[PDB]
Amino acid sequence: RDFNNLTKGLCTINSWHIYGKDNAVRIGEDSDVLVTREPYVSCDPDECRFYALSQGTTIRGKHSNGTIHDRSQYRALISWPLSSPPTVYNSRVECIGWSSTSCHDGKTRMSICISGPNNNASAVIWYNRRPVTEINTWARNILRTQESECVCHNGVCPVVFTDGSATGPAETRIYYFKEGKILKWEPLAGTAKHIEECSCYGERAEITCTCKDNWQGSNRPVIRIDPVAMTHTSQYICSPVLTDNPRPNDPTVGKCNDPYPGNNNNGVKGFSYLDGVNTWLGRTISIASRSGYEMLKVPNALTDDKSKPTQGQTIVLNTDWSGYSGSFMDYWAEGECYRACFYVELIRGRPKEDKVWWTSNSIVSMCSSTEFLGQWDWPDGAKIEYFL
Amino acid sequence: RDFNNLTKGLCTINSWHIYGKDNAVRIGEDSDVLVTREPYVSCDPDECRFYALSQGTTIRGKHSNGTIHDRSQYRALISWPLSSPPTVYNSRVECIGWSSTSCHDGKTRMSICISGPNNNASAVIWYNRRPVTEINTWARNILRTQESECVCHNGVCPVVFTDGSATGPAETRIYYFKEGKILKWEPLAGTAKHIEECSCYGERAEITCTCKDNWQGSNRPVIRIDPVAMTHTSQYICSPVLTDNPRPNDPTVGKCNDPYPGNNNNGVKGFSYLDGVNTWLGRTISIASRSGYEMLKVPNALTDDKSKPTQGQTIVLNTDWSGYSGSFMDYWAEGECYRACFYVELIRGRPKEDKVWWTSNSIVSMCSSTEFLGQWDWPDGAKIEYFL
Amino acid sequence: RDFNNLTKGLCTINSWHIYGKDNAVRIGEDSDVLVTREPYVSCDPDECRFYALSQGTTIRGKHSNGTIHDRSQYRALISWPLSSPPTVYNSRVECIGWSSTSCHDGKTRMSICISGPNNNASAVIWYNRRPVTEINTWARNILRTQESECVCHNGVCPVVFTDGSATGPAETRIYYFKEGKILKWEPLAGTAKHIEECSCYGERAEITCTCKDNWQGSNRPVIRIDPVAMTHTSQYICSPVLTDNPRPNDPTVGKCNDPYPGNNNNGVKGFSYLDGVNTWLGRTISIASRSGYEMLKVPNALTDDKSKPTQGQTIVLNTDWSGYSGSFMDYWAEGECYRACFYVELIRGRPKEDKVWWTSNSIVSMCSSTEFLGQWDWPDGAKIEYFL
Amino acid sequence: RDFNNLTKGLCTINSWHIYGKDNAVRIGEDSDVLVTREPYVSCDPDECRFYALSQGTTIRGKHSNGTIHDRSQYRALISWPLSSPPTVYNSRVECIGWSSTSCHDGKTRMSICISGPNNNASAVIWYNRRPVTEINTWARNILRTQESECVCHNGVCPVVFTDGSATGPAETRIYYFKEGKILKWEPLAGTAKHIEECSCYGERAEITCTCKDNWQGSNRPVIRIDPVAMTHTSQYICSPVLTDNPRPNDPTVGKCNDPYPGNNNNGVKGFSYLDGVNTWLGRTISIASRSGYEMLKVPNALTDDKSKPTQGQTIVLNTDWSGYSGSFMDYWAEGECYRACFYVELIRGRPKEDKVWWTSNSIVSMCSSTEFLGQWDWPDGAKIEYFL
């Protein structure tokens, strides 16, 4: 109809209720489910759907051997109905590639997929299900993007890309698209020293992205964007409650403008909702691997370098595998506020469960409640032994 | 369009004709059919569909082992086209949980799913396919609901929940929702001593629910609701024709305001159509197990404590497995009256057929005819031996 | 929109072109295809679809054992997209039963399914996907109907039913339905001595049905209906070119008002287009079994007792299995005339191919061309050996 | 809405970006994917889809044995969502036959399928999903058509057919259809000596077809059509950069009006975009077999007999199997120009990979970019060993 505008503020998050779960690996043990990783959730004005990067093979299929690899000519961004598994028969390909983002602007959807060899990748920006714009690699070192939805405001949908090293400074750019066309792009500015896989959400005409500093930071970099002025800033979450993985143990004081040290060249896509006292951080329970998942209310995490938790909720037990996590919200829901939501990728297979030759995942996702709801833990649920 | 209003009375029930049957277990022996239980049927203004609680695995899948259990993080309310089986590819997830209800108000649908551990469950009420309201467990003992459709009148859709003991008094509440929002809730009132899994239908601005007294009653409790005044009453079906299971043999006089004794802490979801002489009771043929199924015309069953059958119809032979049963009607059908319908869950597998490690079911459903139609029996139809 | 009226005459049939073929048995050797028999084709104003009676099991499924039987509680009328196979995932159940008919009146569709034991069957007439009317068996001996589409004119859709003996006189009735409601019914009149499984088509406000005299006739009975006056007549195809099966060899003179003798208590559903010189007869090539299929132009077959062929077209070689055949036309096609179409059921399995324990079929269908097209033969195409 | 008119010129082709890829053979190793060959892509005003000729069997199905053969009664033109594989459950049959073409005129789609024995084939032209016209074989020797989309202008959609020898002069005709009806047909004129399987595209009210001279030419014949005057001409691509296969090595001077000699009675469907300096040629890398694939910018290829490459892009490595290739464009995309696109059939199985008894393929397709994008190679991706 008309372009959506971020006119609401976030609803108060007093807990998280269950939103969607596809049990993909369980069901896929005996049905035609595509192998995936790097999933997310994204809404249209009339429907919310699960997204991910297919590996172009079923889990039980012999071609599942080797799916631990991240980039191949057989991956594609696919979307499918909420809480269903990604099957060969119900999955809709948005675009071909090994890194992606997607978001609805209120009128139609924009999806971006990057493909190519490491030194010659290119992104093709689709809008209304047609290719419109293409962008060639600028640093010739794995052009890559969000792996979760972008956010739009009055037709302007900013997207964060990174090209260059994963273990040293790289070239991050913020592109501002409108109807699949480039209105403007900036180089990364601010104090964030390395940016990868940003998780974004918007409220009151401002887009907040919680990303990952793969190079040095165990605290997360944050990019805040003004989609009207088409400008941005960057810093790190000040809080001592560190949210990357692997990471060192929590200190008592964090860092606001530098990576918090202790772990180099590694990390996991994550997210956060930074809204003063209504601030919640997501993170794996384990400091060593993508194991477990919890949400922690850390008032003023973004700006208070001594902020510690005041409430929390376990999403996945530390005895269960987790993975990537990101933000999304239904901007077309009724009501006076935007209800914060997120998903957790539940990785199964390699490298942690190597008795199988594949790597895939399932999705669990929650949204906020103003009530103080009881908690449950939500594991993938599959028995690897069955696949043997 | 506009909210539906219960303006018609029930059609005269002179017999029951076949409405839908999915033959899920038969077909699922060699195709991707989800394991389910707790099914029901519910209509939208333009389509009627089968509903049930998936177990998050196919019947032939190895994860089917253990599906006798009622609550896990892998269940979800799914709906699928009428008389089709619940397949991985055609099933639509309404919400995640292990207990549910759902109904269309004329404009859009409201679905409710409860999930959680036993001592910390929570219900999330979805409307127009979006989460709108959440309710935390109030007795910390398996918050649970209908397991069949709710009914709406002018936007108001009452739902019956129970939290607390299954073998002693519990806390039953009647919530009145409008557009997924809580307008009001009452504690159970009346003479019913325990309420679980209510089967409801509406006619002439009144909603009648035939539930189950798991604690002591072999006769069924009945809750009648006025969705305008948003008030209700409760009592038991007076009739000596006892309809729970297991149950003692039929007496010659029943009980109107107390559970009819003889069987404690057990039962099965059931239903009835209470409409003076146009009254029909459904029940298993066996008094010991969920075996067989029949419909009995028992004039004035609700208010006559000596009422006995005047006509009847066998639905399932006593040599075939049955299970839960509930009411639904197509409130958007043409004509001057509402045609009473019901479904019977045909349970296969554990605990009765333990040569297999799973428990699932198929659905058979009928609606009333003003004709006096010949009868057939409708079994599940699957041979367990094939699954061995 | 508005009810369709049969205002056109038939197009000149100079040959038959290929219309649809699903290759169901071939494909079903390795995919989830439902076992069927008694198929047909029927159009809506915006789409034409394949129909048949499912057996409630896949072909490869173990429950396929025993599908040679005609009536069970596991059958249902299902429809699916043109030329696709009937799969568990794309098949839409119209109604539950073991004998059926269906037709679109221009506004919406009416489907009829009969179910029950032999001595207590009942038909339930659905309209706009809702049950509207029910008719109980009147002779208590396998109430049965067309097994192909009915035809409508100004909302009136006549249907032919038979109840009683298959090897002696029976009670055939012609029901005239409008919006699923019975406007009137007549007993069979005319000279036809036994009627079963009528194949109908309409043109210029008249409906012609070519049926089967199971009792004594090797020539086909024909019922012509006036859907305005709601009256009909009956006789046999006069032609010596006999079209039932099994049958005696062709004589030089046929019978207009009596069954042509030589074969008792047997036959196959068939059809014809009776339009003066533009008359075409369909029949198996074999006089002994449902083997092969051909179309023969027999000018004035209906009224000329010495009429013999003037042109012809082989549809299926005598070295391939055939089966039932019936008429349908797209009454919503563009142009000045109705293009005659028909389908042939290609039966595979029992009783002829008994190395397998099942019986199913595929569908091949053609429509007329005003050109004189070259011919091909269209077999099922499956190798039974693969199923062993 | 209104008939589409070719009012735009082609966009400048500076490179090719990835558009769609279905990975059909990989996925089909463990899922219900139909065996195909002769694929293409074609757009409607609201969606672009993959097309191909099914073999009427799954790849893993036993009936896949023998699919190396080109014509059988089990083939059909099927279409399915872009970048999905052709599965039994998501494939839509357009028409039955072993040679086809299809195109949307802006209002609705016209699809053509030819079926029959070699000496008696016939084409049936469908429009708006209904059969409208039929054309009988005129030379009684494998009536055949494009195997890629046709193009329309103001309701007029020209199609190129060939009937007669594959190794000597044949009878090629250009039919001009409007709403499935024949407006006019011409015999082939110009200097092309043999025409088969034309790949067409339209721009500025002119349709260009790059076909194949199976008899003698290693350079490609080109037919240019004026869909208003309904007239055409023909010649060969002048360029020494030969694009058929097998073929001799490239000379330094080509032929404009005669087949370039060196290879008789063989070839592969191919295409080109002839637009002055904005000219690009597609061809297999190997001169001996359907191996590899590349795009070469050959300015003025059509008219310059010494034209050689000025830029290029590898699509498939010479160490990977390729096959047919053809043109299509989204005539309903936004913007001021038509973006050239093409697909490459990636053949797997027989005759090159004979350890399996089947022959099928997957599809890879690209479209032009005005950017100079980095290149990747796009193989089928399946391991034949897995099918053993």
Ligand SMILES: *[C@@H]1O[C@H](CO)[C@@H](O[C@@H]2O[C@H](CO)[C@@H](O[C@@H]3O[C@H](CO[C@H]4O[C@H](CO)[C@@H](O)[C@H](O)[C@@H]4O)[C@@H](O)[C@H](O[C@H]4O[C@H](CO)[C@@H](O)[C@H](O)[C@@H]4O[C@H]4O[C@H](CO)[C@@H](O)[C@H](O)[C@@H]4O[C@H]4O[C@H](CO)[C@@H](O)[C@H](O)[C@@H]4O)[C@@H]3O)[C@H](O)[C@H]2NC(C)=O)[C@H](O)[C@H]1NC(C)=O
């Ligand atoms: C039914 O449902 C309800 C609703 O969910 C249940 O009630 C909930 O229960 C939760 C568990 O108790 C509770 O969550 C906790 O909240 C704490 C905050 O509240 C407390 O402190 C505040 C502030 O003073 C008080 O106001 C309040 O009254 C409480 O006393 C959090 O602090 C908890 O998180 C910390 O503990 C968990 C383990 O339990 C860690 O996994 C988590 O990471 C936190 O601790 C680590 O991090 C901090 C910060 O740096 C460190 O200080 C600390 O030592 C830990 O550090 C180590 O571990 C991390 C992680 O592995 C590692 O990285 C680091 O290096 C160190 O190794 C927790 O979130 C809910 O708030 C509460 N909800 C409500 C509404 O009440 C109820 O129990 C259920 N009922 C039943 C019957 O089961």
Ligand SMILES: *[C@@H]1O[C@H](CO)[C@@H](O[C@@H]2O[C@H](CO)[C@@H](O[C@@H]3O[C@H](CO[C@H]4O[C@H](CO)[C@@H](O)[C@H](O)[C@@H]4O)[C@@H](O)[C@H](O[C@H]4O[C@H](CO)[C@@H](O)[C@H](O)[C@@H]4O[C@H]4O[C@H](CO)[C@@H](O)[C@H](O)[C@@H]4O[C@H]4O[C@H](CO)[C@@H](O)[C@H](O)[C@@H]4O)[C@@H]3O)[C@H](O)[C@H]2NC(C)=O)[C@H](O)[C@H]1NC(C)=O
């Ligand atoms: C073709 O189709 C038609 C249409 O369906 C067929 O006709 C139908 O046939 C049905 C079977 O006969 C018939 O159903 C019965 O109706 C009885 C009522 O009618 C009779 O009584 C009235 C009232 O006086 C008369 O007016 C009327 O003329 C009849 O005489 C019911 O009473 C029957 O139900 C009871 O029996 C069945 C077993 O047959 C039990 O399963 C059922 O539970 C009922 O009996 C139990 O319950 C009562 C009440 O408390 C007890 O008194 C009794 O002893 C039984 O109790 C034991 O069993 C229960 C259940 O297991 C247990 O819990 C308890 O503790 C005890 O152990 C029955 O419903 C249809 O009405 C009739 N329909 C029509 C339209 O005519 C026709 O036959 C078919 N044709 C062919 C050729 O097959």
Ligand SMILES: *[C@@H]1O[C@H](CO)[C@@H](O[C@@H]2O[C@H](CO)[C@@H](O[C@@H]3O[C@H](CO[C@H]4O[C@H](CO)[C@@H](O)[C@H](O)[C@@H]4O)[C@@H](O)[C@H](O[C@H]4O[C@H](CO)[C@@H](O)[C@H](O)[C@@H]4O[C@H]4O[C@H](CO)[C@@H](O)[C@H](O)[C@@H]4O[C@H]4O[C@H](CO)[C@@H](O)[C@H](O)[C@@H]4O)[C@@H]3O)[C@H](O)[C@H]2NC(C)=O)[C@H](O)[C@H]1NC(C)=O
């Ligand atoms: C390319 O395509 C074209 C287009 O299809 C091909 O041309 C077609 O070829 C067809 C086969 O020749 C042909 O079909 C035949 O038409 C005959 C009628 O035409 C002839 O007679 C008329 C009338 O005098 C002449 O005007 C005309 O010029 C012809 O001479 C039919 O009579 C044929 O049917 C009979 O034969 C077939 C076997 O071939 C039987 O299966 C069929 O049942 C008919 O014969 C039985 O029935 C009659 C009637 O009672 C009996 O008299 C007769 O003895 C047979 O009876 C026995 O068999 C039956 C059936 O099993 C059994 O029940 C009975 O008891 C007995 O046992 C046939 O239909 C097309 O018309 C023709 N089309 C066109 C447009 O030309 C062309 O050849 C192809 N090209 C190539 C290169 O292949």
Ligand SMILES: *[C@@H]1O[C@H](CO)[C@@H](O[C@@H]2O[C@H](CO)[C@@H](O[C@@H]3O[C@H](CO[C@H]4O[C@H](CO)[C@@H](O)[C@H](O)[C@@H]4O)[C@@H](O)[C@H](O[C@H]4O[C@H](CO)[C@@H](O)[C@H](O)[C@@H]4O[C@H]4O[C@H](CO)[C@@H](O)[C@H](O)[C@@H]4O[C@H]4O[C@H](CO)[C@@H](O)[C@H](O)[C@@H]4O)[C@@H]3O)[C@H](O)[C@H]2NC(C)=O)[C@H](O)[C@H]1NC(C)=O
């Ligand atoms: C990241 O991405 C970018 C973007 O893609 C990469 O850059 C691209 O790199 C491509 C490969 O180098 C390049 O493609 C080539 O373009 C050549 C034309 O450019 C050159 O010449 C022009 C004209 O003078 C100059 O202006 C320009 O500066 C260049 O110098 C083509 O000529 C190339 O094609 C020929 O070679 C390939 C093998 O490499 C053959 O397969 C192809 O068929 C061509 O050669 C055959 O055909 C010709 C013509 O008849 C014969 O003369 C020749 O001998 C060959 O003939 C034999 O082989 C054929 C085929 O098998 C057979 O039939 C015949 O009988 C003989 O046996 C080639 O197309 C892109 O243009 C370039 N793109 C851009 C934008 O720069 C970049 O490298 C990537 N980065 C990294 C780090 O990898």
Ligand SMILES: CC(=O)N[C@H]1[C@H]([C@H](O)[C@H](O)CO)O[C@@](O)(C(=O)O)C[C@@H]1O
């Ligand atoms: C799913 C799981 O087993 N997680 C466990 C992980 C992994 O075993 C290792 O991190 C793999 O290296 O290790 C822990 O010690 C941890 O990190 O807290 C315990 C946790 O329960």
Ligand SMILES: CC(=O)N[C@H]1[C@H]([C@H](O)[C@H](O)CO)O[C@@](O)(C(=O)O)C[C@@H]1O
């Ligand atoms: C929420 C829940 O667990 N419901 C379960 C109920 C309760 O156990 C009883 O109502 C006792 O409260 O009964 C079942 O076990 C049963 O009888 O088949 C199935 C059902 O899933």
Ligand SMILES: CC(=O)N[C@H]1[C@H]([C@H](O)[C@H](O)CO)O[C@@](O)(C(=O)O)C[C@@H]1O
């Ligand atoms: C499907 C079935 O076999 N049902 C039978 C059941 C079960 O065997 C037991 O109730 C299981 O405990 O038992 C009966 O004695 C009964 O209750 O009337 C007979 C009935 O035919």
Ligand SMILES: CC(=O)N[C@H]1[C@H]([C@H](O)[C@H](O)CO)O[C@@](O)(C(=O)O)C[C@@H]1O
């Ligand atoms: C209702 C019914 O059973 N119809 C069956 C009829 C009747 O048996 C005959 O018409 C005798 O009346 O014929 C079949 O057996 C047959 O010949 O293939 C199939 C069909 O299903």
Ligand SMILES: CC(=O)N[C@H]1[C@H]([C@H](O)[C@H](O)CO)O[C@@](O)(C(=O)O)C[C@@H]1O
């Ligand atoms: C498919 C097939 O094999 N059909 C053959 C049939 C059957 O073998 C028997 O009729 C079965 O009884 O028999 C014929 O003699 C015939 O009737 O004309 C030859 C025909 O080719």
Ligand SMILES: CC(=O)N[C@H]1[C@H]([C@H](O)[C@H](O)CO)O[C@@](O)(C(=O)O)C[C@@H]1O
């Ligand atoms: C109608 C038809 O059979 N077309 C076939 C053509 C013809 O054989 C050649 O064009 C010679 O005319 O070529 C193929 O065999 C091929 O080369 O892969 C495939 C295709 O199906």
Ligand SMILES: CC(=O)N[C@H]1[C@H]([C@H](O)[C@H](O)CO)O[C@@](O)(C(=O)O)C[C@@H]1O
């Ligand atoms: C996929 C593949 O293996 N292609 C190879 C082909 C085939 O082996 C033969 O052409 C089959 O005859 O042969 C080459 O010599 C060539 O033609 O350039 C090398 C190329 O790498």
Ligand SMILES: [Ca+2]
């Ligand atoms: Ca399978």
Ligand SMILES: [Ca+2]
């Ligand atoms: Ca890091």
Ligand SMILES: [Ca+2]
């Ligand atoms: Ca009880």
Ligand SMILES: [Ca+2]
């Ligand atoms: Ca007969």
Ligand SMILES: [Ca+2]
């Ligand atoms: Ca050639």
